[PDB]
Structure to design on (1240 residues):
């Protein structure tokens, strides 16, 4: 009873999470084989292939797109969480539940609908032209702006909740003391509120950034052939080319950033207390 | 004034594509760029499609099963973590935090590699296990967070009053955790109805799901039958969530 | 006339907490607001500090209106009950927080902070986070933080409520000495009568948002104005004494529950009026006799003898059936004192040591 | 008739020995109060008595039956918590009857027992009222009622009346004493207050760092302390130094206190050249007024301050040596002779045979 559930959950997690992760982390140090996908030869040829400009230019573009999407999510989500906490407590769960209702429809259908809504001859251009604000139709498809907009639209709710949890747990008398001591909104926000909510920011950034570089359908539908993410390369290597060690080597760059962000989160949590 | 405007703008930005899909469901244009009258042809055409309906049924059943199993396991784990006090609790907390903050592509790749090595054909079992695995942490977090809304000394009072370990769970812990259990089931159902990466990686030809069918139709072109299916599923999920809430309360 | 409030009204969600308050605070004095739970003292403290806005009235310092000036621009500081004490900065930064927002040159921040920490005896703990310290150290850090900016009045809200019974007595005298040495008026909110009696120079008693009595502790304790103040501070014994006839100017004849006892009345009355005679527990005497016969005064009847250590309290039931509640010192070693139960004793006062109310 | 006998109990927690050794016997039909500063370990004793913790060594017996290893579900011992440990989703009736419903009690007797147990608590009306709609005092009353119904042989209380205000606490003190007298079972109380312990308890045990210091009647602890810590813990005391010169009679010993000779009462055997402690309480010191060389007999000191507590006047007297002496009296404003004598040469006297003398 006391230990049975712990043993069950630990066994499940070990079998389904870390054992396959260690299996893949060793797959990069293998040799391509057409029979069993692996040959027990310890070679480093997989990693040095990533240093070619062709296989390096895409990584930087994906990193830039993810950074812009994460920053946009932060800027659009921090005010939303702050303003939600300043509302009557009888309406908070209702507004916090409406952020999830759109998730019931599949993400691919929503991305397709957004693609239709932003088309050159479609809506948001005829409407913006009938009421005169812009002279010519706006062309946004097959550009990084479309990819960033889609990523922000898909992954926005995943960042608001940690920020709301961090904000709602704040101590009210701490802000009152700052106001009494002679602090305006700006100085308070810089030097008291923001330091106390760093773990929420780090958690939101972790939840927004890493998924944003594995979403291949967004780039496939609204990015084109010049705007590619890591997920597209990984899918091509794992389902068409059948070069598994290359995908295993590529995933290590994704794991390293996660480890670094986890370390930053741990140091921030230690310093906060 | 300006606060409500910002909140309304965010909500509209989040909700505009859904209204567009719903409107284009009853539209007449095949591409759906413009509006050319009101028809009901798309619903009739969808009613005769077989693969799409099979994919929708498979997706709904998969979501229900995964949500149930994940809710059960997560509730048990959260109760175990809260009831017993030990030095290893932060270790399990960090374990679940790390498994929560992991990329979808890496998890899908690892699960595919493990299943290929083990010698298991892809299909129902692989998809169900992957869905349970990636839906586990959220239910644990929800039930774990809810429990500390009450004092811990209540269990000691029950022990002093003459209560066994089995009666405590039935008569105290479960009454106070049912609202959290329902929330976990609803959240698990929502997550499993939107995943496209893991499902696209660990699926098989025998079991066909809605994301894969839509992705296949994308290359050639999609019809407003997808719109009709989407609005029907929206209505079904809307009645399902209120039914679950009524059952919980 | 430092801070004056005229016609201040405050309604919270349609419920009125401060009907009408007129109050003037002088310069260089200790003022304590006293009362039961939920009487709006904290509302007045917040309104003076600038945390809330009034619905009517005017507030001034030095003849300058502050009714709508926000809290950042007012020369008034407050000490919080919970010791806010930002956890991510050290004691030095906590104390210097106020100076950095007033654009103080860097050549004087350190000496001022060090002197402020000296005033509260916290030199050595200059660099320690606000979690390695105890309650008293945290309270002293907060007090030092409030007094750096040199405000015109310091506001305290239940500052020493969460400490033990030993540090409390020391820090009461410490706060009084600090107020005497520095030279600004102090406003205190507390629920303890002993603190207000031993630490203040002027006490205001509030109940349900209205001022009941304001004055020095001697007048508040020993010359109450109504029946609420006489009873909130210390035990009281109320006796009904209807006047049937009056003998002379001050010496009035009163039938004190069917007795024959004349008292002092300093205001005009007429025969047939109803007067309340109030006496403290320590201003009553008893008479012990072995014989069961009732004499020497009214009836006597003892329930128990409390023996709370320092003092011994005895119940004296009279003929009418009301308690008396005598309190007097317990000298053990005594050749003729030691108590006896269930006897027929007598009760007496000390010839106009009482208080008479209309 | 002994009820609980603790013999040789030792408890070590995380490598730290909270209770090194403890021998204590609890009788039948009394109000026992455990007193001490924070961190002495009263709560540990309470929890081992109730059975929520296990002992590293020793034996615990009730009615000559050993229950040292019996789990904390079969003991006839009930406890009252500080937070009242109240179930939120149940009602007052359900909370009170939780204990009876799980002892295989017949259903024909559950309702009258609970309903009459609420009578001893004065909560007749609120039988069907849920918590979080009741005040703190009513919640404490519910907790006491819940603990009482099972009819235990020993009820344990842990700082029950710490969170309430003054008057309500004073009322519940007498209410609890009356309840203990009416029921007929032994109560154990853990508290930090002093007057609270002195008002009710028939036996006071003082603990410090896991050690028992004194055990006796409230008179026997307030008026006959055994060591300096006990004397200084309850009330205020004045520590004076003296040196024994010679013995006058069987109950009088000459000594030199603070540089001036005096007569004191010492019972135990003494020898010349020994150092003794003379402890006096503030109420027992009489101070006279010396305007111009009048009544200058006894110890000589100067008064520096006069504090007014409302009921009592507090005066501090500074002696020639430099030792602070604190004197407490009453306050009679409407009484001639009294009033302020801010600065002059005062004299301090005390009534004979009111001293407490301690050796070493």
């Amino acid at each position: 009873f006391q230990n049975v559930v712990i043993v069950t959950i630990v066994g499940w997690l070990v079998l389904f999470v870390f054992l396959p992760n260690l299996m893949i982390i060793g797959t990069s140090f293998l040799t391509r084989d057409d029979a069993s996908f692996v040959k027990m030869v310890f070679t480093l040829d997989n990693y040095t292939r990533l240093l070619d400009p062709l296989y390096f230019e895409v990584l930087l573009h994906s990193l830039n797109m993810a950074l812009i999407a994460t920053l946009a999510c932060l800027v659009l989500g921090y005010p939303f969480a702050w303003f939600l906490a300043k509302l009557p407590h009888k309406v908070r769960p209702l507004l916090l539940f409406l952020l999830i209702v759109p998730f019931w429809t599949n993400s691919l259908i929503r991305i397709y609908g957004l693609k239709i809504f932003l088309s050159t001859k479609g809506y948001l251009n005829e409407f913006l032209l009938w009421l005169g604000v812009i002279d010519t139709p706006i062309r946004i498809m097959f550009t990084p702006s479309a990819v960033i907009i889609g990523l922000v639209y898909i992954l926005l709710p995943f960042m608001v909740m940690p920020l709301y949890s961090s904000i709602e747990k704040l101590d009210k008398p701490l802000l009152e003391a700052a106001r009494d001591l002679g602090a305006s909104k700006l100085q308070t926000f810089i030097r008291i509120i923001i330091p106390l909510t760093m773990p929420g920011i780090i958690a939101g950034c972790l939840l927004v950034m890493l998924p944003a570089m594995g979403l291949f359908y967004v780039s496939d539908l609204m990015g084109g052939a010049k705007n590619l993410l890591i997920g597209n390369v990984i899918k091509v290597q794992f389902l068409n080319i059948r070069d598994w060690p290359f995908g295993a080597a590529t995933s290590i760059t994704l794991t390293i950033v996660m480890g670094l962000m986890l370390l930053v989160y741990w140091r921030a949590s230690r310093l906060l207390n | 004034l300006l606060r409500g405007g910002f909140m309304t703008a965010i909500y509209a930005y989040l909700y505009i594509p859904i209204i567009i899909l719903i409107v284009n469901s009853f539209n007449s244009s095949r591409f759906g760029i413009n509006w050319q009258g009101f028809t009901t042809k798309w619903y009739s055409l969808l009613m005769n499609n077989d693969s799409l309906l099979q994919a929708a049924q498979h997706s709904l059943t998969m979501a229900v099963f995964s949500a149930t199993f994940a809710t059960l396991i997560g509730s048990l784990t959260a109760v175990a973590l809260y009831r017993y006090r030990f030095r290893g609790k932060p270790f399990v907390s960090g374990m679940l935090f790390v498994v929560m903050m992991s990329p979808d592509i890496v998890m899908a790749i690892s699960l595919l590699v493990l299943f290929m090595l083990l010698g298991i054909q892809l299909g129902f079992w692989s998809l169900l296990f992957s869905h349970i695995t990636f839906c586990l942490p959220f239910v644990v977090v929800t039930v774990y967070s809810r429990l500390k809304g009450f004092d811990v000394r209540m269990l000691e009072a029950a022990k002093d009053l003459g209560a066994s370990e089995f009666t405590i769970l039935r008569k105290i812990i479960l009454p106070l955790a049912m609202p959290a259990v329902a929330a976990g089931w609803v959240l698990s159902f929502t997550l499993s109805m939107d995943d496209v990466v893991v499902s696209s990686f660990v699926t098989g030809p025998s079991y066909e799901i809605l994301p894969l069918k839509i992705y296949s139709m994308v290359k050639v072109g999609v019809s407003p039958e997808v719109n009709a299916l989407a609005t029907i599923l929206l209505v079904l999920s809307l009645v399902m969530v209120i039914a679950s809430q009524l059952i919980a309360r | 006339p430092l801070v004056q409030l005229a016609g201040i009204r405050k309604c919270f969600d349609g419920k009125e907490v401060i009907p009408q308050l007129d109050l003037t605070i002088n310069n260089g004095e200790f003022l304590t607001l006293l009362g039961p739970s939920g009487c709006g003292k904290t509302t007045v403290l917040r309104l003076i500090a600038g945390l809330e806005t009034v619905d009517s009235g005017r507030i001034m310092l030095d003849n300058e209106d502050i009714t709508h000036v926000p809290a950042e621009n007012r020369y008034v500081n407050t000490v919080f009950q919970s010791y806010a004490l930002f956890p991510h900065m050290t004691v030095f930064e906590n104390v210097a927080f106020g100076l950095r927002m007033q654009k103080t040159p860097a050549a004087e921040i350190t000496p001022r902070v060090m002197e402020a920490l000296r005033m509260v005896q916290l030199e050595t703990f200059a660099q320690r986070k606000p979690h390695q310290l105890s309650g008293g150290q945290q309270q002293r850090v907060a007090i030092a933080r409030a007094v750096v900016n040199k405000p015109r009045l310091l506001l305290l809200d239940q500052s020493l409520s969460a400490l033990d019974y030993k540090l409390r007595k020391q820090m009461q005298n410490e706060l009084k000495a600090l107020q005497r040495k520095l030279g600004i008026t102090f406003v205190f909110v507390t629920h303890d009568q002993e603190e207000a009696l031993t630490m203040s120079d002027r006490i205001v008693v509030m109940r349900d948002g209205r001022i009941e009595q304001d004055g020095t502790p001697r007048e508040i304790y020993e010359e109450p104005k109504n029946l609420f103040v006489a009873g909130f501070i210390g035990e009281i014994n109320m006796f009904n004494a209807t006047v049937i006839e009056r003998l002379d100017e001050q010496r009035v004849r009163a039938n004190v529950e069917g007795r024959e006892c004349n008292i002092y009345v300093n205001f005009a009355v007429e025969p047939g009026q109803k007067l309340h005679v109030l006496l403290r527990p320590e201003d009553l005497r008893v008479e012990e006799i072995n014989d069961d016969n009732h004499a020497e005064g009214l009836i006597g009847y003892v329930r128990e003898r409390n023996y709370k250590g320092m003092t011994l309290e005895s119940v004296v039931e009279l003929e009418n059936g009301k308690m008396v509640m005598v309190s007097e010192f317990f000298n053990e070693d005594d050749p003729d004192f030691d108590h006896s139960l269930d006897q027929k004793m007598a009760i007496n006062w000390v010839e106009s040591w009482e208080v008479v109310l209309a």
